[PDB]
Write a protein that binds this DNA or RNA. Structure first.
Lengths: 86, 171, 50, 493, 64
RNA sequence: UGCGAAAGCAGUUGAAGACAAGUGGCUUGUCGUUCGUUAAAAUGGCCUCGUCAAACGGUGGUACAGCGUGUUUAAUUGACAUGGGUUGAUAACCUGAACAGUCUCAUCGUGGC
């Protein structure tokens, strides 16, 4: 259930969140990577946000929100974001 | 003269630290007691001696803050899920750190710690941090007065040791 | 005159003192001091049962 | 902040006939052994000194049993007629046995082949032989000659004292446990005589009139002695020549007594009594010789004993029956380099100035219902109630904790047919008891309040409700007729 | 009294505080004490407040 | 709400104003608004500080249950390096200064394992 963010160069963890209660099957992001959405077998969709200017200048995601919308699982998640569609 | 010759130790001496200012030497080992010796040349005597029951100690450190240099804590810890902190006052007021603030799975033993100084970098306020070496690659850094988990640093592999470097920036 | 101040070291190097009216004590006088030997660390913020 | 209070197990008002500490201690004498003897077990003595062996006198043999294996370690079979009494000396070193031909033979214990001396007492059968309890070298033998004799075991030719005076069949001796000059003897005419041995000795100093023919006399204090004979036993203060208790709690004649002091027990002293009808009972000398526990055996019990005061091991109660068998009930009781590396772990702060202690004590393990009530899993706590291996007071206390604490309805919300049947199937059993039936009443009332439609659908809990109806019908007939008995003795005030 | 680690949203609790917390605040320069006001509302006939600071190290009630 | 006993016995539930929604009004509903009357819901639940084993003393119903043995009327001792790593879908295995004073081990011989 843990969701981790890793610096690519230096190949190493920046921060770990203990978000879900069971596996995280699928996670996705938006265009400018201000949000990361994530979901799995415990059937909640978590949202990790970095939209604040301090968040962007400090590289610090926060565990922003959490929604319970699905009945059994979430096995697939995806995002689209355009001028008249997000 | 052998420093603990005045009062013998009942175990192998696992850690050993001088005071930053005073002529004091703190020894400690697996017989779960820690002894302070006023050292000099001739007669290294025993200042005081504290026996923590059920808590063999493996690392013991004199911490002395940078703000007022008047705290004089002793942080001590062994293969336990807690770490003691004696506040030196010459009864003895010691506190126990036993809460990783959400991070108990990655820190199952407080053996390998180190104490260091940290600056707030928006105020010029320093405070001591203790740094615990945990299981996966984890170093859990936490406040030396409140015990609050400040941050954690994970390396990739089997963490074996670590050290603290400082570098000045300005006045 | 009638007053005697003796000195010892309580911890390793810190001197402690005692005043005595030496004219009215007995000949073989044994001063008793309270000194930590095995005392359970009674913290003031906790009762005896922990 | 505090620690969490433990879930208190629901204790009701206590019912009559609770388990006393005396009867808990005397009830853990178990694992009975029945050893069939050749004839009726008449006497049984214990070794005093290493108080760990006992001699059983059957007919024409005396067997020493061990108090750790309960088998015959050693046996004494070279008697010509029926051997009657067999006791150990106070040092536990040698063993005297009176025989039906009036030949006291004393061997040494733990060596049946060396008969040490054979006192030729009266031509009549010698029925009781015991050494002095203070002195070591005098042996008191009474016989069917109506005269007891004190023998010095050095001069074993003439008796050093001849205590006569009794009119019929002296069957018991006893010595008084602080004054060593004082021998209390008991005969089949009643009349416990007792003798000062510095005097003539042909006359008792006084006599205690037990009215029945006495079977045994033992000494409890240095002052008071207890004589059994007939259906009762009486106790006698000896400094004042005067009876002060009598207990007649048997059907037939009390055959024997013995007494225990200072042993590891809630009872500080204990007199046990064996009484020809099957019963051996234990009486407590400190509250007025009241009976505290008893055993019933498969025939008339002829003699009994217990392990002595300093037994230090496997402790025994033995009773030999007139049927010819013997019943025993017992209560039982890395590298030098690595150690040099891990040396200090056993030090515990002796020479150290301050000694800090904040290791918390480890409490009892929480059961699953208690940790589920702690974790606020209230339906899981109900499920953990109705497992099969649960105590009835434990099911009751988790029902009562869910009743007082939160909501019966919360604990019962998500249920259906298959998950209510444990509750109602326990409520059948709990409706009978007084202590459970209030809780069973409101739990059944709530579950039929909020599952009245599942009543319609499922037929396989309709029948459970019908069985519950007949249960409450039986219980309401019982609770009505109890009120009728209550009135019918309210009439008799 | 819960304290939320706002980085990982991780609670540390202190659960049985003989009164509801109607005020809580950090107190020291380094934040080594928490001061709390506990309203103790089992009696409805009076508003009886307990003042409880506690050291933040081992979360023990220093000076209630 | 009042009088009460723990049963019960008498009383109910108005008005103003503002705002919100729906279709300037009309309807409905609210109020960190006033006057008068004795008058269900935001997936959102409780910390670590050492476990395990075996006893013992009381207490309930002796395998059952519970409290205690830090001082108490009474009654407790012992194991464990309270870690790290690899599998494991609890365990096994590896590992940290883990053979060796009653010195341990190797090798070549001598005499009788």
């Amino acid at each position: 259930g843990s969701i981790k963010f890793w610096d690519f160069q230096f190949a190493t963890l920046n921060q770990s969140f203990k978000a879900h209660d069971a596996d995280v099957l699928c996670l996705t992001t938006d265009t400018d990577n201000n949000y990361v959405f994530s979901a799995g077998v415990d059937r909640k969709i978590f949202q990790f946000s970095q939209n604040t200017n301090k968040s962007q200048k400090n590289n610090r995601w926060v565990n922003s929100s959490n929604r319970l919308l699905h009945g059994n699982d979430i096995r697939a998640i995806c995002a689209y974001q355009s001028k008249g569609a997000d | 003269k052998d420093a603990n010759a005045s009062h013998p130790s009942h175990s192998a001496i696992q850690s050993l630290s001088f005071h930053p200012s005073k002529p004091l030497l703190l020894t400690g080992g697996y017989d779960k007691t820690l002894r302070i010796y006023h050292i000099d040349g001739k007669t290294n005597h025993l200042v005081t001696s504290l026996h923590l029951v059920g808590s063999p100690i493996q690392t013991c450190t004199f911490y002395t803050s940078l703000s007022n240099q008047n705290q004089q804590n002793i942080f001590t810890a062994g293969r336990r899920r807690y770490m003691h902190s004696w506040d030196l006052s010459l009864t003895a007021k010691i506190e126990k750190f036993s809460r990783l603030y959400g991070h108990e799975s990655t820190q199952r033993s407080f053996e390998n710690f180190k104490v260091a100084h940290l600056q707030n970098s928006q105020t010029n306020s320093v405070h001591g941090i203790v740094l615990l070496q945990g299981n996966n690659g984890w170093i859990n850094i936490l406040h030396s007065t409140s015990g609050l988990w400040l941050m954690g640093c994970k390396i990739e592999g089997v963490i074996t040791d670590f050290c603290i470097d400082y570098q000045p920036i300005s006045r | 005159k009638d007053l005697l101040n003796v000195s010892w070291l309580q911890n390793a190097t810190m001197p402690y003192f005692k005043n005595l009216q030496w004219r009215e004590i007995p000949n073989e006088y044994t001063v008793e001091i309270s000194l930590n030997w095995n005392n359970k660390n009674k913290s003031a913020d906790r009762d005896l049962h922990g | 902040s505090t620690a969490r209070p433990r879930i208190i197990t629901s204790k009701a008002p206590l019912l009559p006939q609770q388990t006393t500490p005396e009867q808990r201690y005397w009830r853990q004498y178990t694992s009975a052994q029945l050893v069939k003897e050749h004839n009726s077990v008449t006497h049984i003595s214990f070794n005093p000194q290493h108080p760990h062996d006992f001699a059983v006198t059957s007919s024409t043999r005396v067997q020493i049993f061990s108090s750790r294996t309960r088998q015959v370690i050693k046996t004494f079979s070279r008697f010509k007629d029926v051997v009657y009494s067999a006791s150990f000396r106070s040092d536990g070193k040698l063993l005297c046995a009176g025989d039906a031909t009036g030949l006291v033979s004393v061997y040494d214990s733990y060596n049946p082949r060396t008969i040490l001396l054979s006192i030729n007492a009266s031509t009549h059968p010698t029925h009781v032989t015991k050494f002095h309890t203070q002195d070591n070298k005098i042996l008191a033998t009474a016989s069917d000659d109506r005269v007891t004799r004190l023998w010095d075991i050095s001069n074993a030719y003439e008796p050093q004292l001849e205590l006569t005076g009794a009119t019929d069949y002296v069957r018991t001796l006893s010595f008084i446990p602080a004054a060593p000059h004082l021998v209390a003897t008991g005969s089949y005419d009643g009349l416990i005589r007792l003798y000062d041995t510095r005097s003539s000795g042909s006359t008792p100093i006084y006599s205690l009139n037990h009215d029945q023919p006495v079977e045994n006399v033992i000494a409890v204090s240095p002052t008071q002695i207890v004589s059994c004979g007939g259906n009762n036993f009486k106790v006698w203060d000896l400094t004042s020549n005067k009876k002060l208790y009598e207990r007649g709690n048997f059907n037939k004649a009390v055959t024997c007594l013995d007494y225990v002091e200072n042993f590891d027990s809630p009872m500080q002293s204990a007199l046990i009594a064996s009484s020809l009808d099957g019963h051996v009972k234990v009486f407590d000398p400190l509250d007025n010789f009241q009976v505290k526990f008893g055993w019933k055996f498969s025939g008339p019990v002829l003699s009994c004993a217990v392990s002595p005061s300093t037994a230090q091991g496997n402790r025994h109660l033995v009773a030999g029956l007139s049927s010819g068998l013997l019943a025993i009930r017992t209560k039982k009781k890395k590298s030098n380099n690595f150690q040099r590396m891990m040396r200090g772990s056993e030090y515990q702060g002796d020479q150290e100035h301050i000694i800090h202690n904040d290791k918390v004590r480890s409490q009892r393990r929480m059961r699953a219902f208690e940790r589920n009530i702690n974790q606020f899993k209230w339906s899981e706590a109900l499920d953990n109630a109705f497992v099969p291996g649960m105590a009835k007071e434990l099911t009751l206390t988790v029902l009562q904790e869910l009743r007082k604490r939160g909501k019966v309805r919360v604990a019962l919300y998500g249920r259906d047919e298959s998950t209510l049947e444990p509750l109602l199937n326990w409520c059948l059993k709990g409706i009978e008891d007084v202590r459970s039936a209030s809780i069973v009443a409101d739990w059944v009332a709530v579950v039929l309040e909020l599952y009245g439609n599942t009543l319609e659908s499922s037929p396989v809990l309709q029948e459970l409700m019908i069985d519950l109806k007949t249960k409450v019908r039986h219980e309401i007939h019982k609770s009505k007729e109890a009120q009728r008995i209550e009135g019918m003795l309210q009439l008799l005030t | 009294m819960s304290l939320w680690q706002l980085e990982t949203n991780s609670q540390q609790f202190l659960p049985r505080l003989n009164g509801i917390i109607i005020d809580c605040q950090v107190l020291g320069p380094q934040g080594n004490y928490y001061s709390l006001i506990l309203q103790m509302t089992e009696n409805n006939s009076n508003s009886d407040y307990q003042f409880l600071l506690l050291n933040a190290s081992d979360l023990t009630s220093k000076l209630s």
